[PDB]
Structures are given as structure tokens and as C-alpha cells.
Amino acid sequence: IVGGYTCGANTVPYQVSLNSGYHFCGGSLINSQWVVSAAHCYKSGIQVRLGEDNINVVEGNEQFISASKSIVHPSYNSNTLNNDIMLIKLKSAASLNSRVASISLPTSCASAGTQCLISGWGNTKSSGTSYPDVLKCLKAPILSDSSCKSAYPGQITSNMFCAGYLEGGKDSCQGDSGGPVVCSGKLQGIVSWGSGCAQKNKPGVYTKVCNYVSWIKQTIASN
Ligand SMILES: *[B](O[C][C])(O[C][C])[C]([C][C][C][C][N])[N]C(=O)[C]([N]C(=O)[C]([C])[N]C(=O)OC([C])([C])[C])[C]([C])[C]
Numbered sequence: 001i002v003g004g005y006t007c008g009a010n011t012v013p014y015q016v017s018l019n020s021g022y023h024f025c026g027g028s029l030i031n032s033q034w035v036v037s038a039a040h041c042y043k044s045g046i047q048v049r050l051g052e053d054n055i056n057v058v059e060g061n062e063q064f065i066s067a068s069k070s071i072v073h074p075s076y077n078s079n080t081l082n083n084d085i086m087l088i089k090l091k092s093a094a095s096l097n098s099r100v101a102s103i104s105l106p107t108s109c110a111s112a113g114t115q116c117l118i119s120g121w122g123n124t125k126s127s128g129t130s131y132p133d134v135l136k137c138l139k140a141p142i143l144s145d146s147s148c149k150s151a152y153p154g155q156i157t158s159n160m161f162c163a164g165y166l167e168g169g170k171d172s173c174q175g176d177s178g179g180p181v182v183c184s185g186k187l188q189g190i191v192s193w194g195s196g197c198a199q200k201n202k203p204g205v206y207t208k209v210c211n212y213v214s215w216i217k218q219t220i221a222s223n
Pocket of ligand 1: 026175203
């Protein structure tokens with residue numbers, strides 16, 4: 001997260017780290033057995049780590065559960081990143097308490113101007129690299145689809161939204177992929193991609209979760 005703040009231990013309780021020997025992606029817990037993340041985060045042998053703050057120290061609130069299945073969206077296109085969303089089923093249900101909890105799925109799409117919380121363990125520098133060990137948080141508005149489209153000409157599909165600061169300075173970055181964009185208490189986006197991090201006139205682009213609500217409910221009901 002570039003230009004954000006230390007969240008505080010377990011203040012973002014649906015935040016998961018996806019681990020295959022090291023943290024490689026974030027995700028959100030949507031019920032005790034399923035996580036949503038970005039399809040570009042796919043790999044075999046994911047261990048899901050819940051109740052995390054410092055990802056390098058066991059502090060006592062952690063639940064590490066292996067993934068049983070991963071389902072990348074049927075129309076995920078890696079060359080355009082259209083439909084960049086995946087579901088991960090846990091091998092056992094997580095225990096939900098105040099520090100480990102699920103995030104609500106939206107029933108409406110969020111409007112531009114809505115403020116959102118984006119969180120994660122990715123790079124905190126626009127140029128150069130420092131990866132935090134503790135979870136960082138960023139509050140950012142959803143930008144209008146005209147500003148988004150003028151910033152990324154011929155690249156925003158109807159399943160993408162931009163959130164951030166056109167002036168730059170604050171943004172999601174490498175290592176935040178798959179993590180939550182939560183607006184008004186509902187999960188509205190997934191950290192997807194952008195031209196670098198925190199560059200002027202290049203805000204982050206996010207998978208628009210409200211467009212996937214029926215595919216998510218359907219898939220959970222049948223697996
Ligand atoms: B993400 O985070 C860690 C798992 O995923 C893999 C490195 C990161 C999140 C970036 C958020 C930025 N606001 N996602 C990516 O790096 C994705 N790639 C891009 O965004 C690239 C760097 N963008 C790019 O080349 O820009 C254009 C010229 C506009 C195409 C990708 C791996 C999904």
C-alpha cells in the first residue's frame with residue numbers, strides 16, 4: 001500500500017494472506033469456507049492465513065488452513081485481465097470471532113465519490129521496494145468511469161473500476177493483489193492492476209465485485 005497507514009492488529013478481520021511458502025497475494029473471507037482473490041493470484045498449493053497482522057511472527061490469532069479447490073472465473077482473460085476474480089474453498093471452515101470474520105458481498109454497485117478501505121502487505125514505495133510485515137490500510141474514493149477511461153484509454157472493461165488519487169501519492173502496489181476494496185461495509189473490489197503504483201494520473205484498477213455476485217453465490221452453492 002503506498003502512502004497508507006498501519007491498520008492495527010486485526011482491525012481488517014476479513015483480510016487473508018495467501019501463502020505458498022511466503023505471502024504472495026491477499027484475499028477476503030466471504031463465509032467460513034470461501035475466500036475471493038484475484039484470478040492472476042492463481043497457483044497450486046495455496047495455504048490461506050487468516051487472523052494475520054505481522055505475517056512474519058506467530059502472534060496468537062492465526063488460523064492457517066490449506067485450500068481444497070480454487071475456481072478461476074470462466075472468462076478470465078490474462079492478457080486483458082478482464083474478469084480477474086477467483087474463489088478458494090478452504091479445507092475446513094475457519095472459526096469466526098471478532099478478529100476473524102467475513103465481509104458482506106454487495107447488493108448494489110458502488111457509486112463514484114464513495115470512499116473505500118483498501119488493505120494489504122504489498123510494497124510501500126512507488127520507486128524502490130520495502131515490504132511491510134504488518135498490514136497497511138488506505139482510504140480512497142471510487143473515481144468516475146470517465147476519469148478511469150481517460151486515464152487508461154481502451155483498457156477499462158465494464159468489470160473494472162478505478163479508485164485512488166489522480167494526483168498520485170497513495171495507491172495499492174505489488175503485493176496487494178487479490179485483497180479487498182471495502183466501501184460502506186460491503187466488498188466492492190479486488191486489487192487487480194495499474195501502471196506502476198502511485199503515479200500521477202494512473203490510479204489503481206480494481207475488479208468490480210458487484211458484477212460477480214450471482215457467479216459467486218452459484219459456485220458456492222454447488223461446490
Ligand atoms: B499484484 O500484487 C501482488 C500479488 O500482482 C502481481 C505482481 C499487483 C497489484 C498492483 C496494484 C497497482 N495499483 N498487480 C500487478 O502487478 C499486475 N500488473 C500490473 O498492474 C502491471 C505492472 N501494469 C502494467 O504493466 O501497466 C500497463 C502498461 C497499463 C499494462 C498483474 C501482474 C496483474
